[PDB]
Design an enzyme around this catalytic site. Sequence first.
Site, short mmCIF file in Angstrom:
data_model
loop_
_atom_site.label_atom_id
_atom_site.label_comp_id
_atom_site.label_asym_id
_atom_site.label_seq_id
_atom_site.Cartn_x
_atom_site.Cartn_y
_atom_site.Cartn_z
N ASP A 281 0.86 -1.19 0.00
CA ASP A 281 0.00 0.00 0.00
C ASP A 281 0.90 1.23 0.00
OD1 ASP A 281 -2.79 1.18 0.25
OD2 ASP A 281 -1.93 1.84 2.16
N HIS B 149 -7.57 -5.81 -1.38
CA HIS B 149 -6.42 -5.00 -1.03
C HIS B 149 -5.59 -5.64 0.08
CE1 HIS B 149 -3.99 -1.48 -0.01
NE2 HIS B 149 -4.37 -1.64 1.24
#
Length: 336
Positions: free
Chosen positions: A116, A313
């Site tokens: 991320d 994610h």
Amino acid sequence: MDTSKLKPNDPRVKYETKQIRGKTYSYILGEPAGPKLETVVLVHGWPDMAFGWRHQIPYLMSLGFQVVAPNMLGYAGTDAPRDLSQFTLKSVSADIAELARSFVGQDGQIVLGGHDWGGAVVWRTAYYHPELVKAVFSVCTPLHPLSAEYKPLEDIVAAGHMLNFKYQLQLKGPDVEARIQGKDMLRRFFRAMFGGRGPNGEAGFSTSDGVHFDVLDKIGAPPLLDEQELEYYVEQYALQEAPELRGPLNWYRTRELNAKDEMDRAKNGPPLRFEMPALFVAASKDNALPPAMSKGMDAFYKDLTRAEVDATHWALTQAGDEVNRVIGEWLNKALG
Ligand SMILES: CNC(=O)c1ccc(O[C@H]2CC[C@H](NC(=O)Nc3ccc(OC(F)(F)F)cc3)CC2)cc1
């Protein structure tokens, strides 16, 4: 040794702090099984912490790696400076560089992993400190070019562009920082961020509007954190001073500062060129960082290894065993 994922306050690792470039940096330290092959530094993202690598840390340890997973600037036991220039990718890259060299010495090298916002950090860290990064991998986060121009994100999404990033407008504003304070709101916030749903399937977060405060009341158990892990995130995020999320949300308030650093690099400095071995693990169901966003990324790399994982994610955990497999085998070829 035991390769199962870290539990909250797992005794297989150590929890330490060091002074790094003026800040207290807390980190997880895992010692290798056998003689040390390399030292691996893992960089988490938002809204995660060092514990987010709980699947990778004991695995990389069992492979013979020393593992340093810091709580990044603003998270948990790590300082959250008032100044926003501390939160640029350049400054944070310098933090990682000094922390990594605090273990391998100034002449040493490391393996660098990011996810991320951490994935963006490790690409920039490999760019700013190639002397240090022997190999670098990033999950979800592709490479993004050196900023040649600064435009406010409001105007970008107002023109219909970068619509997958429109949640950042709320995050950088005052709404999330003001409303998500205390452990009660943090627990609901983390239930939202890790897949929890409401009685009628209401999502607590979206890439368009950000946190749906109206929904956090009825937000249910998240499928991607167990009760013990969720409470750990709450406890560690509670270590920040109220408002607890200022530090983490500061990562979304540095678009112009990052633009000023990299507009300089685009004009005078070296280009985005990665000579060391590199790995990019895309996540198929990541709506924030979709795989298609990494289109022309390969041209910047002498040695980029591509993989993609069918996961959201939260691929480090949801697909922890598969991500561990991709890293270990690529690392095995990258090091020889
Ligand atoms: C071509 N490349 C580009 O344009 C580019 C790539 C990366 C970049 O920096 C990124 C910015 C975003 C930041 N991560 C983030 O915001 N993560 C996030 C989102 C949403 C969440 O909620 C969810 F929906 F996922 F549950 C949870 C985490 C990483 C670095 C800039 C430009």
